[PDB]
Amino acid sequence: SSSEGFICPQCMKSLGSADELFKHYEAVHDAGND
Amino acid sequence: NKICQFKLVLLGESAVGKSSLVLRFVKGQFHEFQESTIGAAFLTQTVCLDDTTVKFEIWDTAGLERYHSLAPMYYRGAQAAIVVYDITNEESFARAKNWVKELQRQASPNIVIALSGNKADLANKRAVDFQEAQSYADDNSLLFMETSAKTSMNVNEIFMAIAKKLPK
Ligand SMILES: Nc1nc2c(ncn2[C@@H]2O[C@H](COP(=O)(O)OP(=O)(O)OP(=O)(O)O)[C@@H](O)[C@H]2O)c(=O)[nH]1
Ligand SMILES: [Mg+2]
Numbered sequence: 001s002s003s004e005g006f007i008c009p010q011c012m013k014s015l016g017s018a019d020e021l022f023k024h025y026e027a028v029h030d031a032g033n034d
Numbered sequence: 035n036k037i038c039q040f041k042l043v044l045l046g047e048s049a050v051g052k053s054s055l056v057l058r059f060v061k062g063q064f065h066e067f068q069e070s071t072i073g074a075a076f077l078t079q080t081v082c083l084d085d086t087t088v089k090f091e092i093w094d095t096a097g098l099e100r101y102h103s104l105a106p107m108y109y110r111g112a113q114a115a116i117v118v119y120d121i122t123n124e125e126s127f128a129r130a131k132n133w134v135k136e137l138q139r140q141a142s143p144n145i146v147i148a149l150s151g152n153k154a155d156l157a158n159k160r161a162v163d164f165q166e167a168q169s170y171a172d173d174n175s176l177l178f179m180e181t182s183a184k185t186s187m188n189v190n191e192i193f194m195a196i197a198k199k200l201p202k
């Protein structure tokens with residue numbers, strides 16, 4: 001797991017693109033959902 | 035003795051030297067051919083002061099404008115920031131002020147902000163006067179130093195200044 005890239009700062013999940021990161025973050029870390 | 039952990043974020047225009055600054059601090063290294071960051075890189079390093087081990091969890095963000103909207107994800111819950119400009123580039127200093135503003139408006143109320151005037155080894159090509167940057171820092175309670183990731187000038191010093199100011 002690369003120490004650089006579109007890493008989620010909350011769980012350190014490495015995602016393949018910025019869009020996948022935004023998607024991931026909103027599904028798992030924002031206020032239950034949205 | 036005790037250990038204090040803090041999330042720290044590096045922000046600033048592309049090519050100002052954010053990844054170089056942190057590589058210097060973390061690894062004691064510097065690359066002339068450092069690659070532009072894609073997204074953000076995670077690094078960590080400690081300082082010690084007043085019996086306290088201060089551990090920085092560092093997010094080195096990509097400065098390119100296309101990544102602007104990702105920055106808030108990385109400075110969410112950040113207790114410290116370093117906004118970096120290039121002393122040979124007055125426009126990079128204008129972009130630095132706008133990052134400082136965004137931080138004032140959108141970051142945690144407790145954030146300790148440092149301002150780095152980087153590439154100070156190139157002082158013979160200076161575009162940004164020291165006292166102008168200092169005046170801006172003083173007026174906004176920013177910690178300001180001119181640094182050089184290349185020579186190592188003030189690199190440890192700026193991170194130590196942050197540590198001092200952070201609630202411990
Ligand atoms: N002379 C001099 N060159 C520096 C200094 N710091 C960084 N550089 C060089 O400036 C170029 C860009 O540095 P980076 O660390 O990659 O800049 P960055 O802010 O991380 O750029 P992005 O990741 O695109 O946002 C590289 O060639 C570095 O070697 C410095 O203090 N003095
Ligand atoms: Mg970089």
Ligand SMILES: [Zn+2]
Binds near residue numbers: 008009011024028029
């Ligand atoms: Zn995550």
